Amino acid sequence: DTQVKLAVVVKVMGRTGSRGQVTQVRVKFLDDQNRLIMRNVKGPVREGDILTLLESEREARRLR
């Protein structure tokens, strides 16, 4: 099974996608405040938003 994990956008990196509709941010896990990983988010997002992750493992790559 999977458990929904909760993360915080700590810095926002850029705008990926063909049409720039996706942002790339670095998130930080609230339970383990040592695991910082890259994710892609759809929709407006600033520094400090809390992102819900259905799975935690998937980690984006630079300029994905």
């Binding site: 695991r35 990983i37 890259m38 980690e59 790559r61």
Partner: protein
């Protein structure tokens, strides 16, 4: 017109240089002309180094690097952005 003084390859005093196969398309390209890069890259990138560094049994374990010497024909190197079309003046720069 003659684009370059070296003819596009590094051959002086020889008559024949053995060819090599392009790493992407297998095109035969002489060794002195192909675009040769030596890549020393890590086993995993830095987002996923520590969740292997914490799973090392031994203290002081150093994760290897992969070393590969990659050749490209002119077409594949140009298309893969390994080398770029430069201006007439900056073509002469070998640095």
């Amino acid at each position: 017109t003659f684009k370059r003084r070296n003819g596009g390859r590094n051959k002086h005093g020889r008559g024949h240089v053995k060819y090599i196969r392009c790493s992407n398309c297998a095109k035969c390209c002489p060794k002195d002309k192909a675009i040769k890069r030596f890549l020393v890259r890590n086993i995993v990138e830095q987002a996923a180094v520590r969740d292997v560094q914490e799973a090392c049994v031994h203290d002081g374990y150093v994760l290897p690097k992969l070393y590969a010497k990659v050749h490209h024909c002119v077409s594949c190197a140009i298309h893969a952005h390994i080398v770029r079309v430069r201006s007439r003046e900056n073509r002469r720069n070998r640095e």
